T-cell receptor
Framework: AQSVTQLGSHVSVSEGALVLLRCNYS??????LFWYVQYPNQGLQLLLK??????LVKGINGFEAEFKKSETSFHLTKPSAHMSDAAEYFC??????????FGKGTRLHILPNIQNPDPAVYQLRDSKSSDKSVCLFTDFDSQTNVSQSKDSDVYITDKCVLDMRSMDFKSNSAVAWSNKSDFACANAFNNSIIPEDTFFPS | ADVTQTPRNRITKTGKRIMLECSQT?????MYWYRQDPGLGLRLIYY???????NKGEISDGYSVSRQAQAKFSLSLESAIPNQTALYFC??????????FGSGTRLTVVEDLNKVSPPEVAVFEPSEAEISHTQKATLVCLATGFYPDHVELSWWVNGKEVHSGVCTDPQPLKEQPALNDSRYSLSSRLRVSATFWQNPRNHFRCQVQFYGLSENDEWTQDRAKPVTQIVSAEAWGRAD
């Protein structure tokens, strides 16, 4: 009868904006509630929990959650999204006086503030003396997204954000490649809607 | 470390009995085994409140457990099947929902060990056009042709591991999506200043830890036995 619901397997937030991850529960009597965070290939870390004491529960790193009985909710918040907040978050609830049951999880994706976009498609050559290449689409802002390949012999990755600490600089990129010698970087991202000002060097 | 799990990683063929161990030092009555799958969270398999008291969770089929001591709770896959591929977590709890999780067991069950294959790894050097346009330089690592999907990629600059300026794909892609036993590929980027790439004294290495066969596994093919191993590729900086 008792459950916990998180909707949206993947959610976005702009860098520096309010973080809000939603959790609702179905228990008739108020339960204990928990929020855990997980980084890739790591274990679970407790952020905060409601244990029938304070209703505004504070957590580590500026996280908070308010237990609201009348709308059966325990939403997790943080005032400002940082790149290091990128992780998967699980809401969980007590059940049957003997266990914790977990929500399905939500992965939080932080959209970096790219104030000087410089979209471009580059060709990169193998360090060894094959004439193998890959294609790198980089330096586009938040309004561009990368579509999957329409050709089973052309491989295209999801966009990935890197954070160069040395220059306090973040950028988006996707990589494409193909085992066809004729494949060209000018055409690699033709199934994606790319910026009209994308740089294509020759 | 209060809660410890073994093994940390394992690959197995289908139809084998597999045992995972959880041990604790605090002697809490309550111990639990969960599995984690993408999009499903953590699902309870079995739990125990004392030595010989056992309770099914939501996904107990295909599994058994034994509580051999206050300190120990064992999970068995009775006859492993591919859909038992998962990250497995044991936990203890005190009397007030104070949970402690073990660090996890990554288990991969494959139908046919003959398909196991380590990656080929290549580094692709920064474009002169990126360098001129941006005064930055992105290296790309590609790991290809590996099976199963069970790898760890890292970057090493002048012999030390780096995290800054790196982005690795969160999941490998299938090279042949139509096939149940497709091999996989994975990419990563490491971005540095153009100045740093242009120094011929700087050394860049992409490392891929692959988890495959063990010494005990049989191997009847001519090609290299695809054991757990590290495969790297490298590049030196360059002015031209």
């Amino acid at each position: 009868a008792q459950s916990v619901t998180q909707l949206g397997s993947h959610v976005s937030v702009s860098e520096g904006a309010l973080v809000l991850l939603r959790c609702n529960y179905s228990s008739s009597v108020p339960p204990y509630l928990f929020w855990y965070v997980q980084y890739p290939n790591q274990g679970l870390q407790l952020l905060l929990k409601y244990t029938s004491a304070a209703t505004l529960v504070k957590g580590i790193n500026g996280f908070e959650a308010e237990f609201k009985k009348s709308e059966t909710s325990f939403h997790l918040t943080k005032p400002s999204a940082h790149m290091s907040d990128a992780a998967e978050y699980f809401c969980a609830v007590s059940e049957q006086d003997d266990k914790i049951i977990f929500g399905k999880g939500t992965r939080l994706h932080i959209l970096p503030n790219i104030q000087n976009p410089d979209p471009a498609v580059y060709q990169l050559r193998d360090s060894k003396s094959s004439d193998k290449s890959v294609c790198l689409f980089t330096d586009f802002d938040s309004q561009t997204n990368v579509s999957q390949s329409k050709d089973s012999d052309v491989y295209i990755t999801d966009k990935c954000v890197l954070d160069m600490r040395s220059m306090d600089f973040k950028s988006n990129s996707a990589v494409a490649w193909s085992n066809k010698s004729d494949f060209a970087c000018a055409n690699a991202f033709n199934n994606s809607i790319i910026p009209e000002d994308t740089f294509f060097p020759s | 470390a209060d809660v410890t799990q073994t093994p940390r990683n394992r690959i197995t063929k289908t139809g084998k009995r597999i045992m995972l161990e959880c041990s604790q030092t605090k002697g809490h009555d309550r111990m639990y085994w969960y599995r984690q799958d993408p999009g499903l969270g953590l699902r309870l398999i079995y739990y125990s409140f004392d030595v010989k008291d056992i309770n099914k969770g939501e996904i107990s089929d295909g599994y058994s457990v034994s509580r051999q001591a206050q300190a120990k709770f064992s999970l068995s896959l009775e006859s492993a099947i591919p859909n038992q591929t998962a990250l497995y977590f044991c936990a203890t709890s005190d009397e007030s929902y104070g949970y402690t999780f073990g660090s996890g067991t990554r288990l991969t069950v494959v139908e046919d060990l003959n398909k196991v294959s380590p990656p080929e790894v290549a580094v692709f050097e920064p474009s002169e056009a990126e360098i001129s346009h941006t005064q930055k330089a992105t290296l790309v690592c590609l790991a290809t042709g590996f099976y199963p999907d069970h790898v760890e990629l890292s970057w090493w600059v002048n012999g030390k591991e780096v995290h800054s300026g790196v982005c690795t794909d969160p999941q490998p892609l299938k090279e042949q999506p139509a096939l149940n036993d497709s091999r996989y590929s994975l990419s990563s980027r490491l971005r540095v200043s153009a100045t740093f790439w242009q120094n011929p004294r700087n050394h860049f290495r992409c490392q891929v830890q692959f988890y495959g066969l063990s010494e005990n596994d049989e191997w009847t093919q001519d090609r290299a036995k695809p054991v757990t191993q590290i495969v790297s590729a490298e590049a030196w900086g360059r002015a031209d």
